[PDB]
Amino acid sequence: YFQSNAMSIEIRKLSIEDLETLIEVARESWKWTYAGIYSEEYIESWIREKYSKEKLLNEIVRSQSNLDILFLGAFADSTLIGFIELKIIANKAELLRLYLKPEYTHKKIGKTLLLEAEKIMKKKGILECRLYVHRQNSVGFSFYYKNGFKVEDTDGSDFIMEKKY
């Protein structure tokens, strides 16, 4: 059935009360996206600047205010286990990050997050979504093509991938 020791798995917008759990979960979304690339030293540092309380708060508020960010969390019985964050400029979107904790890495949850993210974007009118994926990240790359994105270019170390609606 699920193996995630929880009677419900759900997706909703992050609220300002999710802040501290989100910081922990964002900090790992990063050590995994780059565990095979940056040094221990550099990783421990870069998280400070990007996942500060103020920047994550800025992003949750902006998502909550229906402005330039969409920030959904995936929760197992009240526990945050993943998220997806997108920037919305005009009618385009950029998928900035998508993450599930290893213990809950079932492609149906990641797909649920991405799926609810598109339902919200249809209604807002976003017609196009881009994303960046490091070349070694084969799990992401695979997940992405299976859900509709194609390679548009390379940015040195990353595939720029795209999907129109």
From Swiss-Prot:
It holds the Pfam family Acetyltransf_1. Acetyl-CoA binds at residues 98-100, 105-110, 137, 142, 146. The record marks 148 as: May have an important role in the acetylation of the polyamine. It is an enzyme of class 2 (transferase). It catalyses: an alkane-alpha,omega-diamine + acetyl-CoA = an N-acetylalkane-alpha,omega-diamine + CoA + H(+). PROSITE patterns: GNAT. Belongs to the acetyltransferase family. Involved in the protection against polyamine toxicity by regulating their concentration. Could also be involved in the negative control of sporulation as well as production of degradative enzymes such as alpha-amylase, levansucrase and alkaline phosphatase. Catalyzes the transfer of an acetyl group from acetyl coenzyme A (AcCoA) to an acceptor substrate and release both CoA and the acetylated product. It can use a variety of substrates including spermidine, L-tryptophan, L-leucine, L-lysine, dopamine and tyramine. This is Spermidine N(1)-acetyltransferase. The gene is paiA.
